[PDB]
Design an enzyme around this catalytic site. Structure first.
Site, PDB file in Angstrom:
ATOM      1  N   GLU A 239       0.826  -1.203   0.077  1.00 54.28           N
ATOM      2  CA  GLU A 239      -0.060   0.079   0.049  1.00 54.28           C
ATOM      3  C   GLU A 239       0.896   1.238   0.126  1.00 54.28           C
ATOM      4  O   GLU A 239       1.755   1.393   0.666  1.00 54.28           O
ATOM      5  CB  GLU A 239      -0.842  -0.092   1.256  1.00 54.28           C
ATOM      6  CG  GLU A 239      -1.719   1.374   1.492  1.00 54.28           C
ATOM      7  CD  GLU A 239      -2.677   1.266   2.746  1.00 54.28           C
ATOM      8  OE1 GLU A 239      -2.650   0.234   3.414  1.00 54.28           O
ATOM      9  OE2 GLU A 239      -3.147   2.415   3.075  1.00 54.28           O
TER      10      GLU A 239
ATOM     11  N   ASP B  23       0.332   4.966   0.548  1.00 55.98           N
ATOM     12  CA  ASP B  23      -0.640   6.271   0.756  1.00 55.98           C
ATOM     13  C   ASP B  23      -0.215   7.523   0.493  1.00 55.98           C
ATOM     14  O   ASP B  23       0.901   8.024   0.863  1.00 55.98           O
ATOM     15  CB  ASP B  23      -0.889   6.191   2.312  1.00 55.98           C
ATOM     16  CG  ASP B  23      -1.576   4.773   2.863  1.00 55.98           C
ATOM     17  OD1 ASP B  23      -2.455   4.446   2.200  1.00 55.98           O
ATOM     18  OD2 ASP B  23      -0.972   4.326   3.909  1.00 55.98           O
TER      19      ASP B  23
ATOM     20  N   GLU C 203      -3.408  10.803   3.451  1.00 54.51           N
ATOM     21  CA  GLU C 203      -4.263  10.579   4.466  1.00 54.51           C
ATOM     22  C   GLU C 203      -4.302  11.743   5.299  1.00 54.51           C
ATOM     23  O   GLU C 203      -3.328  12.426   5.721  1.00 54.51           O
ATOM     24  CB  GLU C 203      -3.575   9.426   5.397  1.00 54.51           C
ATOM     25  CG  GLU C 203      -3.564   8.195   4.485  1.00 54.51           C
ATOM     26  CD  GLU C 203      -3.382   6.844   5.360  1.00 54.51           C
ATOM     27  OE1 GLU C 203      -2.265   6.532   5.453  1.00 54.51           O
ATOM     28  OE2 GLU C 203      -4.399   6.607   6.128  1.00 54.51           O
TER      29      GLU C 203
ATOM     30  N   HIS D 150       3.998   1.367   2.502  1.00 51.82           N
ATOM     31  CA  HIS D 150       3.697   0.268   3.414  1.00 51.82           C
ATOM     32  C   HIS D 150       3.976  -0.988   2.488  1.00 51.82           C
ATOM     33  O   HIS D 150       3.424  -1.345   1.378  1.00 51.82           O
ATOM     34  CB  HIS D 150       2.535  -0.076   3.778  1.00 51.82           C
ATOM     35  CG  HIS D 150       1.794   1.052   4.716  1.00 51.82           C
ATOM     36  ND1 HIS D 150       1.497   0.930   6.075  1.00 51.82           N
ATOM     37  CD2 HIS D 150       1.094   2.166   4.409  1.00 51.82           C
ATOM     38  CE1 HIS D 150       0.755   1.710   6.526  1.00 51.82           C
ATOM     39  NE2 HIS D 150       0.484   2.668   5.519  1.00 51.82           N
TER      40      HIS D 150
HETATM   41  O1  LIG Z   1       1.423   7.120  12.439  1.00 47.25           O
HETATM   42  C1  LIG Z   1       2.116   6.033  12.122  1.00 47.25           C
HETATM   43  C2  LIG Z   1       1.574   4.738  12.989  1.00 47.25           C
HETATM   44  O2  LIG Z   1       0.816   3.901  12.503  1.00 47.25           O
HETATM   45  C3  LIG Z   1      -0.131   3.619  13.534  1.00 47.25           C
HETATM   46  O3  LIG Z   1      -1.126   2.627  12.952  1.00 47.25           O
HETATM   47  C4  LIG Z   1      -2.001   3.464  12.070  1.00 47.25           C
HETATM   48  C5  LIG Z   1      -1.700   3.127  10.587  1.00 47.25           C
HETATM   49  O4  LIG Z   1      -0.362   4.086  10.318  1.00 47.25           O
HETATM   50  C6  LIG Z   1      -2.890   3.704   9.674  1.00 47.25           C
HETATM   51  O5  LIG Z   1      -2.301   3.379   8.417  1.00 47.25           O
HETATM   52  C7  LIG Z   1      -3.934   2.678  10.375  1.00 47.25           C
HETATM   53  O6  LIG Z   1      -5.181   2.721   9.519  1.00 47.25           O
HETATM   54  O7  LIG Z   1      -4.375   3.040  11.478  1.00 47.25           O
HETATM   55  C8  LIG Z   1      -3.091   2.523  12.474  1.00 47.25           C
HETATM   56  C9  LIG Z   1      -3.501   2.450  14.138  1.00 47.25           C
HETATM   57  O8  LIG Z   1      -3.131   1.003  14.025  1.00 47.25           O
HETATM   58  C10 LIG Z   1       0.504   3.119  14.478  1.00 47.25           C
HETATM   59  O9  LIG Z   1      -0.268   2.712  15.667  1.00 47.25           O
HETATM   60  C11 LIG Z   1       1.626   4.112  15.370  1.00 47.25           C
HETATM   61  O10 LIG Z   1       2.157   3.674  16.478  1.00 47.25           O
HETATM   62  C12 LIG Z   1       2.525   4.458  14.158  1.00 47.25           C
HETATM   63  O11 LIG Z   1       3.497   5.351  14.633  1.00 47.25           O
END
Ligand SMILES: OC[C@H]1O[C@@H](O[C@H]2[C@H](O)[C@@H](O)[C@H](O)O[C@@H]2CO)[C@H](O)[C@@H](O)[C@@H]1O
Ligand code: MG
Length: 431
Positions: free
Chosen positions: A211, A213, A216, A227
């Site tokens: 993925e 992104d 967002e 990702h």
């Molecule tokens: O901000 C980066 C971050 O990812 C966090 O999880 C997010 C993720 O990046 C997002 O794509 C998804 O839909 O939601 C999640 C929540 O699980 C992660 O929790 C952070 O600690 C990390 O730094």
């Protein structure tokens, strides 16, 4: 899934620009937003947030007995709140329809009636306009790419006869278990309804893929995130391979965190937002360049335009702790994750060349408008984890009490996002 026949399928027309020429394309609603019903009549197979246990006693029987139905010209506006004209698309948050109520939406760009458009982003510049002004804390108007199958899964999974035409085959780096159809089969085995979301549940299978992104964002904060996964393209997963939130987060085939470049979290608080350098009160152009060295990706750069100004990406701002990077590179991901104490899953899963090979195989374009039942979008726009005070916890200007879907759904049901002027072309030079 097979297709039902109660509603004809109409893809909403959308224009865009591919290498200097206009393309008359269209978008399609993700099959998860569709009605899933008996192939015999009108009985729901998926009813509220549980499957019918007579029609669906196991996934194979469920797949045989159920169908996903069409979205006709009228339904786009009055069930989903989605409109388009010319090269502009508008997604709505809460739309109260006939007998039911839709929350947000997710669409894919089509190449024709039966296939997604496939984007090869390497050595290209991808741009669009967005108006995020009508998105408060806790919402996310996202534009992003995923390694879906061009045909939505029909060639590979013989019980998927509906295909990209019905928006089948979504996958992303979250290995989502909330997909009702994965690998052509109803994901009804081990289904648990959500406690939190009356339309959603989770099945045993998850749908993993790479993925990218691009965007967002809401009116308060924005990020772009690569990702990478260790598996090739659309990959159904179960068990530990899914890397489920919690203890398994880092043990699956995909990087859930991603290598993220989020200006506010990187110490640039007034770069983007209300009256920021880039002002979320108004439409902006977001330009992303996938730069290659020896035919492989080595950098993803970002430039903004707004009001005739060209605005370079804001650099990392932790003087004497982290170099002033201003783009996603290998060294950025490594140094920032160290500084933020984040596990570098991005590198564990293939890093920049894993991502490059993903981009080289082609991706589908997704636009979506959603809220976050897991973490209230706090990881994008607030502080996360909420009681954390260490570098990288702070993400945006919002309250740690913001973003509960029950609140934002009741208080900002009119929220919208507008995407326009999607374009891909050679990498241009910027002043
Ligand atoms: O901000 C980066 C971050 O990812 C966090 O999880 C997010 C993720 O990046 C997002 O794509 C998804 O839909 O939601 C999640 C929540 O699980 C992660 O929790 C952070 O600690 C990390 O730094
Ligand atoms: Mg195991």
């Amino acid at each position: 899934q097979q297709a039902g026949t109660e509603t004809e399928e109409y893809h909403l027309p959308l224009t865009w620009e591919r290498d200097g020429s206009s393309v008359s394309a269209s978008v399609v609603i993700d099959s998860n937003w569709r009605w899933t019903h008996s192939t015999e009549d009108t009985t729901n197979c998926y009813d509220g947030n549980e499957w019918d246990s007579t029609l669906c006693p196991d996934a194979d029987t469920c797949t045989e007995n159920c169908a996903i139905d069409g979205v006709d010209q009228g339904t786009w506006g009055d069930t989903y709140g989605i409109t388009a004209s010319g090269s502009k698309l508008t997604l709505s948050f809460v739309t109260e329809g006939e007998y039911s109520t839709d929350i947000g939406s997710r669409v894919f760009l089509m190449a024709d009636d039966d296939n997604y458009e496939i984007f090869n982003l390497l050595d290209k510049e991808f741009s669009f306009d967005v108006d995020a002004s009508n998105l408060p804390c806790g919402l996310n108007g996202a534009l992003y790419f995923v390694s879906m199958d061009e045909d939505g899964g029909t060639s590979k999974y013989s019980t998927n006869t509906a295909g990209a035409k019905y928006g089948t085959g979504y996958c992303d780096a979250q290995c989502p278990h909330d997909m009702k159809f994965i690998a052509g089969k109803a994901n009804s085995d081990g289904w648990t309804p959500s406690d939190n979301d009356q339309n959603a549940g989770t099945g045993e299978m998850g749908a993993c893929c790479h993925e990218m992104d691009i965007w967002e964002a809401n009116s308060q904060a924005q990020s772009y995130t690569a990702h990478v996964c260790s598996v090739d393209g659309y990959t159904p997963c179960t068990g530990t391979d899914c890397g489920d939130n919690g203890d398994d987060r880092y043990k699956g085939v995909c990087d859930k965190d991603g290598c993220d470049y989020a200006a506010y979290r990187l110490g640039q608080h007034d770069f983007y937002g209300e009256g920021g350098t880039v002002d979320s009160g108004s439409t902006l152009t977001v330009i992303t360049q996938f730069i290659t060295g020896g035919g492989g990706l080595n950098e993803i750069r970002r430039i903004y335009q707004q009001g005739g100004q060209t605005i370079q990406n804001a650099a990392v701002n932790f003087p004497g702790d982290v170099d002033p990077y201003d783009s996603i590179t290998e060294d950025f991901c490594v140094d920032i994750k160290r500084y933020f104490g984040d596990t570098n899953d991005f590198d564990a899963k293939g890093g920049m060349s894993g991502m490059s090979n993903a981009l080289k195989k082609g991706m589908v374009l997704v636009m979506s408008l959603w809220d976050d039942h897991y973490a209230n979008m706090l990881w994008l726009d607030a502080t996360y984890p909420v009681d954390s005070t260490e570098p990288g916890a702070l993400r945006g200007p919002c309250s740690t009490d913001s973003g509960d879907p029950a609140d934002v759904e009741a208080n900002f049901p009119g929220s919208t996002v507008t995407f326009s002027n999607i374009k891909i072309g050679p990498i241009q030079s910027y002043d």
